[PDB]
Amino acid sequence: WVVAPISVPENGKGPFPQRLNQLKSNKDRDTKIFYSITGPGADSPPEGVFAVEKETGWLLLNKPLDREEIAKYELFGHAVSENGASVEDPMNISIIVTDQNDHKPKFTQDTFRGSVLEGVLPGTSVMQVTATDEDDAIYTYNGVVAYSIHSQEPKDPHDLMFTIHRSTGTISVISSGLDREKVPEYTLTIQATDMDGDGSTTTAVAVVEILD
Numbered sequence: 001w002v003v004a005p006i007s008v009p010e011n012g013k014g015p016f017p018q019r020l021n022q023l024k025s026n027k028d029r030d031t032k033i034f035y036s037i038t039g040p041g042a043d044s045p046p047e048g049v050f051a052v053e054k055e056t057g058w059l060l061l062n063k064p065l066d067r068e069e070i071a072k073y074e075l076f077g078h079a080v081s082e083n084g085a086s087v088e089d090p091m092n093i094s095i096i097v098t099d100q101n102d103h104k105p106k107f108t109q110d111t112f113r114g115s116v117l118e119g120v121l122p123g124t125s126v127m128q129v130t131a132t133d134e135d136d137a138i139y140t141y142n143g144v145v146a147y148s149i150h151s152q153e154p155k156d157p158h159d160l161m162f163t164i165h166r167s168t169g170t171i172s173v174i175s176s177g178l179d180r181e182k183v184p185e186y187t188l189t190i191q192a193t194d195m196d197g198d199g200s201t202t203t204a205v206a207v208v209e210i211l212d
């Protein structure tokens, strides 16, 4: 028989065991048929994730999936007559694990550093920060990053002298007045928010050094 690939959102919560699909042998007219399942997730590590009911053929999921651990399973179903003979061809069972937004973006570094000549103009780029989200960024924004500036210290000649590009993470100088003799170094706190700014948010540091 044939089962069409099955899409299960990770991190579900049943109730378990959850019935995913029912395997059927045509030959249950000449005998009772005993069903069984084999493959990664069933009888090899990680064992017990999937299972099939001996008599009914109901395909079972026994625990929530974690797409970030195993995104896809390829199981194999088998029909055995009561007298012990295999009655069908081994049927492939495809399980695809679909993403929920269960990861917080992380900066590639705890502290990014960069320099600029005291005299550069507003609009000048200093550095490019990056954050990585293990969630899916293809069909959803669960792993898309929005960048923000958390805070600026110190605040002379005033606050918010830097902006960050929302998608690229490029930090730029937006105001005049830089001066090494007055403030050699600015310590920015940077933020990264998945769902393109709507979800979880993590922080890092950006140290901008002012070059005489």
Ligand SMILES: Cc1[nH]c2ccc(Cl)cc2c1CCN
Pocket (backbone or CB within 6 Å): 097, 098, 099, 136, 139
């Ligand atoms: C590839 C794919 N296709 C989907 C179709 C529907 C839903 Cl809700 C989610 C998905 C995903 C995310 C898996 N990374």
Ligand SMILES: [Ca+2]
Pocket (backbone or CB within 6 Å): 010, 011, 066, 067, 068, 069, 102
């Ligand atoms: Ca997960």
Ligand SMILES: [Ca+2]
Pocket (backbone or CB within 6 Å): 101, 102, 103, 104, 105, 133, 134, 135, 142, 143, 194, 195, 199, 200
């Ligand atoms: Ca995420």
Ligand SMILES: [Ca+2]
Pocket (backbone or CB within 6 Å): 067, 068, 099, 100, 101, 102, 103, 134, 135, 136, 142
């Ligand atoms: Ca996820």
Ligand SMILES: [Ca+2]
Pocket (backbone or CB within 6 Å): 198, 199
């Ligand atoms: Ca929110």
